[PDB]
């Protein structure tokens, strides 16, 4: 339940799936086992400041235990830095499909391309479980972006915008619709 944040392996050693190109947190088989963390499953990250985010574990046989490489954007969202400690929890609760999601731009204020963007968000993130108020990262034709989760509507008629390891969650699939309101 306790682990030391680090940085992942630099090269994307192509022993990696493709529905997982993003939202990975490398681990070690030993530290995989020491917390009941099963391949391809999701898992929860709790910050020492009270922030949370969920990611798809992956047991890539690199660095040893105690260390759990993340992504830079993950470290931003969690708001931590190398060496620091973090809480890991094997997700156990339900996981449903997320119908409606509403996010607002970080005010890049590009010429707004409302539907043009969703076509890349979905094709670039299907699988990333979300939470109220996080940051995403598409790259629609080279340029960057940065969004902000405001509300999600879950097909089991529920609404968010999700703090303990045994609750609902939601993820984006090719049927989720999104709106862009400040």
């Amino acid at each position: 339940g306790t682990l030391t944040v680090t940085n992942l392996l630099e090269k994307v050693d192509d022993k990696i799936p493709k529905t997982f190109q993003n939202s990975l947190i490398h681990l070690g088989l030993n530290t995989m086992k020491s917390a009941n963390i099963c391949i391809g499953r999701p898992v929860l990250l709790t910050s020492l400041n009270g922030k949370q985010e969920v990611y798809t574990a992956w047991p890539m046989a690199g660095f040893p235990g105690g260390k759990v490489g993340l992504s830079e954007m993950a470290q931003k969202n969690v708001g931590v830095r190398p060496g620091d400690a973090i809480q890991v929890q094997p997700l156990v609760g339900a996981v449903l499909q997320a119908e409606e999601m509403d996010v607002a731009l970080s005010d890049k204020d590009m010429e707004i391309n409302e539907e043009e963007l969703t076509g890349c968000i979905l094709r670039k993130l299907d699988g990333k479980i979300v939470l109220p108020g996080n940051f995403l990262y598409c790259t629609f034709y080279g340029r960057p972006y940065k969004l902000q989760v405001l509300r999600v509507k879950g097909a089991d008629g529920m609404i968010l915008g999700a703090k303990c390891n045994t609750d609902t969650f939601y993820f984006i699939s090719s049927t989720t619709r999104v709106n862009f309101t400040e």
Binding site: Q97, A155, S174, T175
Partner: protein
């Protein structure tokens, strides 16, 4: 108990199977890939194949109406209605020596006539592989399926497939061709 009916994400939506949480799987005790006669709450039963929930979750049931009841197909989607467990049933499945069908054809508009029966027969024999079907049911074809066939209204079943029956790779498929009870 009582079960919600979520929509169905794409992957399953293709094939036949219906997902389910290990609670109800333990309830009716079917190992896997079994048949489950499901009675929609809108009239007209349905038949699907069992497969466990992805994340050991509970009390939810996603299903896909491939082996439907005639016309009652779309009644399976677009809802939030419950589904009581008693509305599901485990059904025995025999190997169903020989079968017999009446197919619609896909609107390959531009060349009807004498329909090269070898073609339609091969395509149908394909679409019926290893599926369990129960007499008196449509079997739609999945989207973008190959070939010509687009329906297999089920009529002739040799060992009386009234509950249901498994079509095996060694089963004659007589393209009988008798549209039944059209009203």
């Amino acid at each position: 108990p009582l079960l919600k009916l979520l929509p169905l994400d794409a992957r399953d939506r293709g094939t036949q199977r219906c997902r389910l949480g290990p609670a109800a799987l333990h309830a009716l005790g079917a190992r896997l890939g079994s048949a489950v006669k499901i009675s929609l709450p809108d009239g007209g039963s349905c038949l699907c194949t069992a497969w466990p929930r992805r994340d050991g979750a509970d009390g939810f049931v996603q299903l896909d109406p491939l082996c439907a009841s005639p016309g009652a197909a779309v009644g399976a989607s677009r809802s939030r209605r419950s589904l009581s467990l008693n509305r599901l049933l485990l059904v025995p499945c025999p190997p169903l020596r020989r079968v017999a069908v009446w197919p619609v054809l896909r609107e390959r508009a531009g060349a009807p006539g004498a329909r090269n029966t070898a073609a339609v027969l091969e395509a149908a024999q394909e679409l019926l592989r290893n599926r369990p079907i129960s007499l008196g049911h449509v079997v739609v074809a999945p989207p973008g399926a190959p070939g010509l066939v687009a329906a297999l209204h089920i009529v002739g079943g040799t060992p009386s497939p009234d509950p249901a029956g498994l079509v095996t790779p060694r089963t004659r498929v007589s393209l009988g061709g008798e549209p039944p009870s059209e009203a």
